[PDB]
């Protein structure tokens, strides 16, 4: 959690968008039948939730 509290609130948006895209490719890959690591989807989806929580509480 604290590993990213040092960011400057503007590269977090770049992290929001980068992780959102990766999630889409995983769903695209899983539906086709090419994904062999099905566990990765959950960590990516939690990390999206984690980053939004810090931004929300930074502005209270």
């Amino acid at each position: 959690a604290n590993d990213i509290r040092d960011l400057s609130t503007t590269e977090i948006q770049d992290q929001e968008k980068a992780l959102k895209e990766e999630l889409f490719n995983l769903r695209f890959q899983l539906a086709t039948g090419q994904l062999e690591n099905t566990a990765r989807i959950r960590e990516v989806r939690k990390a999206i939730a984690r980053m939004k929580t810090i931004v929300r509480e930074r502005e209270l």
């Binding site: 959102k20 999630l23 889409f24 695209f28 899983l30 539906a31 086709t32």
Partner: protein
């Protein structure tokens, strides 16, 4: 809502894969998504030129495992055709 929440997943079936060489791609979209929001969602993600979009709504089937019966997820399906002078989606 963002372009990657309008679109959910592709559809790969016997009928869906039959029209790949015809430049028609089948997708699962959100229920509340309109025919226009899908056109701009694809243009943003895949960077192609959409020419025409068709949609249809599917009711939920009634499955039965054991003595408990329920309804399969209600779906909304869209078929997007790209113009001739537009790059093709891998989708393989």
């Amino acid at each position: 809502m963002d372009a990657r929440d309008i679109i959910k997943r592709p559809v790969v079936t016997e009928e869906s894969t039959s029209i790949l060489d015809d430049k028609k791609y089948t997708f699962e979209v959100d229920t509340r998504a309109t025919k226009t929001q899908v056109k701009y969602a694809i243009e943003e993600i895949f960077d192609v030129k959409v020419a025409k979009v068709n949609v249809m709504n599917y009711k939920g089937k009634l499955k039965r495992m054991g003595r408990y019966a329920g309804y399969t997820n209600k779906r909304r399906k869209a078929i997007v055709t790209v113009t001739a002078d537009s790059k093709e989606i891998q989708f393989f």
